[PDB]
Amino acid sequence: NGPEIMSKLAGESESNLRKAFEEAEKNAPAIIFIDELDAIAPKREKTHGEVERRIVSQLLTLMDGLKQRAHVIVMAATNRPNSIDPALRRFGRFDREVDIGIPDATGRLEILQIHTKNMKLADDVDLEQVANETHGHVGADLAALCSEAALQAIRKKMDLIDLEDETIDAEVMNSLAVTMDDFRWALSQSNPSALRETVVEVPQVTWEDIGGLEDVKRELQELVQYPVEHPDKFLKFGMTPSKGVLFYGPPGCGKTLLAKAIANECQANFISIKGPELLTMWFGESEANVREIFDKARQAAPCVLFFDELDSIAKARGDGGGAADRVINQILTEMDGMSTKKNVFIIGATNRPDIIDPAILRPGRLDQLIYIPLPDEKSRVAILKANLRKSPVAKDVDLEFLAKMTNGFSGADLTEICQRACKLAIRESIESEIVPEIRRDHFEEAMRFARRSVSDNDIRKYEMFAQTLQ
Amino acid sequence: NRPNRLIVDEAINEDNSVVSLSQPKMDELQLFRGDTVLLKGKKRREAVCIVLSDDTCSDEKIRMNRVVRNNLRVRLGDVISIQPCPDVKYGKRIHVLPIDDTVEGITGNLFEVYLKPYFLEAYRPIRKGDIFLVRGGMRAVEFKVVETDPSPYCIVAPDTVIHCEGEPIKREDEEESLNEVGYDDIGGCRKQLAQIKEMVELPLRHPALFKAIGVKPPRGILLYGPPGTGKTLIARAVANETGAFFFLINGPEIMSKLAGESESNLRKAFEEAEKNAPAIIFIDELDAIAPKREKTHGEVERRIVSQLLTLMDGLKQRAHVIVMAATNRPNSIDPALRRFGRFDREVDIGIPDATGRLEILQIHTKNMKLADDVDLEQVANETHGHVGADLAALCSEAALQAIRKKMDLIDLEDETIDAEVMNSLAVTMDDFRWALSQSNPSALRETVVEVPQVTWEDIGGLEDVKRELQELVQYPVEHPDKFLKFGMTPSKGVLFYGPPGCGKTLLAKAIANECQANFISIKGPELLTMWFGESEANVREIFDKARQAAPCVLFFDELDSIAKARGGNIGDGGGAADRVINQILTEMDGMSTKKNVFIIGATNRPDIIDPAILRPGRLDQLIYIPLPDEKSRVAILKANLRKSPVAKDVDLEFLAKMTNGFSGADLTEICQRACKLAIRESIESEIVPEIRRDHFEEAMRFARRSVSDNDIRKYEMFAQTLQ
Ligand SMILES: Nc1ncnc2c1ncn2[C@@H]1O[C@H](COP(=O)(O)OP(=O)(O)O)[C@@H](O)[C@H]1O
Ligand SMILES: Nc1ncnc2c1ncn2[C@@H]1O[C@H](COP(=O)(O)OP(=O)(O)O)[C@@H](O)[C@H]1O
Ligand SMILES: Nc1ncnc2c1ncn2[C@@H]1O[C@H](COP(=O)(O)OP(=O)(O)O)[C@@H](O)[C@H]1O
């Protein structure tokens, strides 16, 4: 244990380890695990003390002593790669590394099945729903979750009613039940989720939600799938693949939904650095994270790095400056030294193709550019059928009709009018009660507050660019 | 399972002789209103209280204060057995004697001070063994019914003779001092107690339940809050409530001791504390020793930390002990204790609020005779950033004020404290008035997570907006089903905009009281303060103290506060994404979508807002609050002059047509002006204070239209497209 070896009197810490790796090598093959390495690993400047350093050395050595013919494996876990000290990155000590990303969609759900595999769960127990609302949870967080959950179904049944004594009864337990309403409490109970810092999950959306511009769908695969599922044929010709693409056009057209959707079509990770986080780096002139990010994109392959509001930086500033920006430029660096022959696609979308540093489009980085215009009359229909899939859409509901009504709108605006049909549908519900089928009068009474996010003037601006940009 | 054995809960009735039960419960056990009852509990002992009706009490309960509790030797939870006993004929003799450890200092007629006012034709049915407590003379005196003629139990009538051999009695063991701590001494912690209570209900009440079960006995508990919020108080109360041992540790207490020994101090600490387990090891001021954060410039400093860090992961020893740590803030400590095995659970202890404070005082003035003029309410109505501690000495100084005057000057007090004197002592409101004006070094005034004390009775303008607002807040809160019946998601929040004087906040306030949720208010200035210091890091520290207290409404008065600052309209070459403004989008993006928090923001400048806030997903809902209509102007005053001396001749409908371009603010302006002229009349004559017409009219003289006609249109120009 981290502090376990720090608590002990100084000097003895060296003997503690001394006997540690000693008594552990006797039973070798063994696996010396150390929880909280950084608790004694900052050989960094964070040693304003003497013993603090001496302890570090002791290990630093015992490690290069693992070449003793006993075949033992030393495992060290920690918070982050920055906490430790490069002194252990010696290609003889802790040469191998593995990240333990936080639980995701399929992960969490599965996790619970591991801690509820002993308590009788009623049919109403919707285990799925759980992992469907815990956004930044870890295997630990979800742990006590059950803990409190069961204790809830407990303090009620045998507690108020039962016997316990000299000891509990077998029968009782097996009969005990824990409905969904119990866990509901647990969630609303303790929400101090360990973290909600960054995400390296995999997209839970296929092309079944896109339903627009199918052409782009495959062509995109021409830079990502074909060059990864056919590196033999691609190299047959000789040329080298294209690193990444850059989407551009009017907002509210799910461009992100593409780069993300495709991320599933290729079952890879989807890293998303939205514009705000970029600016946050800008206002703090600490784009150093940039190097910290293109790395977590690498320590997780396959993967698709996506930067929304790519111009978000330039958008802020243009002025007496030129194109290149502190963050923007730094990104080019971690993209230049980005392993060419690796497995990582770099996508970026911007509602402002007019204010991008040309260095990104320069062949070798984002030499591929694609325009995803507004929702064609065609796509408009499915767009609705796709944004109204899991919806109490009545039979009289006729979308083809609307497919000709909203022309300047976008996948976003279309969604706008949608939710509006509901914030009026539910209103009928709650009102009269004190009939859940969305009807026409709603949708129509909804277009009343219709808005065209994309003005006609702009409709042309992106085109002015579109041509020369292509 | 026998409608007799019930569970002992709190006590809605603070009487040393009662066991409030539910109405439908009495009917089950055939008990009248004044049917005296026979209580039978553990430790082979009984008592004789009185049963009552309580609509706010589940049939599966029997309310009773600590007195009725202790005498029954039954903590909160255990099983008792009520019983009708209409044969307890009035008693003849009663021998009650005070306790030596509850009278040190007072002297005199105890039969007239405490017993007389107690058995004042109250017919309180006592018994052999009971230990009733009577408050008076600024203190607590515990008595013991040694022997009574009609033993064991005999009702006390205005005839029953009472004896007082005037001789104390050594407190027994099984008998805890009612002077100890408990829940009946905690104010403003509804959401609070709940938290801790059920967390120890099993690991501290049924140590046997975990003897056979694979459940994790929550061992770590942390308490945030500003010093003075009475953190420690709670801890102790919990123990003395379940009966678990209590081992206390002081922050510097373990640092003072010679180095190295600090490890043994704790070594023996958790050691001697586990012997009496189930126990509750509490540590006052954790951050004093656990700042493994950064201030770790010494070995000893570090070595101490480790010792605990380990003993904590040693709580998996099958002894079922609970370690409680309280501190100033979550940043002071060190994440090393956030290990999901040590201090995995956390609970904030917000500062006292409206209902809290008031209630608190009732806990420290429950011994001193307060005159009728004493307006206890007024107190908690002016102490804005006070804590349970601050309000404490408040009484202290207050009483001492009524003290230095009466017996002090009238010198009956050079020798000792006669009983009679104390009980007669009085402490009017004017006394406390001094206290307030005396020491105002209140603890905090930094931030606030209170609940609005204003309904829609003060708004009186644009009713339409009132309900529509509820269409985004009321429905999702209490109607998630119908809501999810379509799969769509609610709106994170609205963005109020319009001309000053409207009353934007009056909405954010009302709607909050409507949902009786918390109302967090970050006015523009505090925003700028973050801007001029480029430390919007607090932003992350704020959207968090809203989730640590849900439901809750986050409000940002004058969102544009950062706009007009950096330039506003033309400003510089920059665009809307401002350092703070943008950072806010972050803590709003990762803000739990499926959580319980509504984000509202109002701005008298809708023309200079970063469009990223209106983007669907954050503040996709926008509402315009226009000036006072022919109507508003009316109700607005009728309301803005509610608790005021408005004469009968006062005719507002008249003014309802006079001020047209004005706003709820301006209207208020002319109002106060009517008074700063009304009070002016008062004084003069003195050397008949009721608002009248000549005032109001003599007030419109200095009438001002905050909203010019040019602007009146500007917001509309926007209104059209913005909506
Ligand atoms: N072609 C489409 N079909 C269905 N929905 C769409 C389509 N395009 C956009 N949407 C919807 O419009 C909104 C636009 O979302 P977003 O992904 O943020 O835009 P973008 O990716 O262009 O930046 C989303 O709610 C999305 O579901
Ligand atoms: N909520 C409260 N109810 C009753 N008394 C309180 C309350 N809060 C504080 N007090 C009074 O103030 C004191 C504060 O005690 P303490 O637990 O040491 O606070 P903290 O540890 O937060 O500084 C208590 O002993 C009590 O007399
Ligand atoms: N609709 C209203 N009805 C009655 N008084 C109002 C109204 N609107 C504003 N006022 C008064 O105007 C002043 C400004 O109030 P407030 O609503 O808090 O400001 P804001 O317009 O910034 O939200 C207050 O003294 C308040 O009592």
Curated annotation (Swiss-Prot), chain B:
The modification N6-acetyllysine is found at K482, K485, K648, K714. ATP 2 binds at G501, C502, G503, K504, T505, L506. SMART domains: AAA, CDC48_2, CDC48_N. The modification Phosphothreonine is found at T416. It is an enzyme of class 3 (hydrolase). GO terms for biological process: aggresome assembly; ATP metabolic process; autophagosome maturation; autophagy; cellular response to arsenite ion; cellular response to heat; cellular response to misfolded protein; cytoplasm protein quality control. GO terms for cellular component: ATPase complex; ciliary basal body; cytoplasm; cytoplasmic stress granule; cytosol; Derlin-1 retrotranslocation complex; endoplasmic reticulum; endoplasmic reticulum membrane. GO terms for molecular function: ADP binding; ATP binding; ATP hydrolysis activity; BAT3 complex binding; deubiquitinase activator activity; identical protein binding; K48-linked polyubiquitin modification-dependent protein binding; lipid binding. The keyword NADP does not apply. It is found in: Cytoplasm, Cytosol; Endoplasmic reticulum; Nucleus; Cytoplasm, Stress granule. InterPro entries: AAA+_ATPase (IPR003593), AAA_ATPase_CDC48 (IPR005938), AAA_ATPase_domain (IPR050168), AAA_lid_3 (IPR041569), Asp_de-COase-like_dom_sf (IPR009010), ATPase_AAA_core (IPR003959), ATPase_AAA_CS (IPR003960), Cdc48_dom2 (IPR004201). The modification N6,N6,N6-trimethyllysine is found at K295. ATP 1 binds at P227, G228, T229, G230, K231, T232, L233, N328, H364. It catalyses: ATP + H2O = ADP + phosphate + H(+). Gene3D superfamilies: 1.10.8.60, 2.40.40.20, 3.10.330.10, 6.10.20.150, P-loop containing nucleotide triphosphate hydrolases (3.40.50.300). It comes from the Eukaryota. Keywords: Acetylation, ATP-binding, Autophagy, Cytoplasm, DNA damage, DNA repair, Endoplasmic reticulum, Hydrolase, Isopeptide bond, Lipid-binding, Methylation, Nucleotide-binding, Nucleus, Phosphoprotein, Transport, Ubl conjugation, Ubl conjugation pathway. Its EC number is 3.6.4.6. The modification Phosphoserine is found at S17, S442, S682. The N-terminal domain shows evolutionary conservation with that of PEX1, and is able to bind phospholipids with a preference for phosphatidylinositol mono- and bisphosphates. Homohexamer. Forms a ring-shaped particle of 12.5 nm diameter, that displays 6-fold radial symmetry. Part of a ternary complex containing STX5A, NSFL1C and VCP. NSFL1C forms a homotrimer that binds to one end of a VCP homohexamer. The complex binds to membranes enriched in phosphatidylethanolamine-containing lipids and promotes Golgi membrane fusion. Binds to a heterodimer of NPLOC4 and UFD1, binding to this heterodimer inhibits Golgi-membrane fusion. Interaction with VCIP135 leads to dissociation of the complex via ATP hydrolysis by VCP. Necessary for the fragmentation of Golgi stacks during mitosis and for their reassembly after mitosis. Involved in the formation of the transitional endoplasmic reticulum (tER). The transfer of membranes from the endoplasmic reticulum to the Golgi apparatus occurs via 50-70 nm transition vesicles which derive from part-rough, part-smooth transitional elements of the endoplasmic reticulum (tER). Vesicle budding from the tER is an ATP-dependent process. This is Transitional endoplasmic reticulum ATPase.
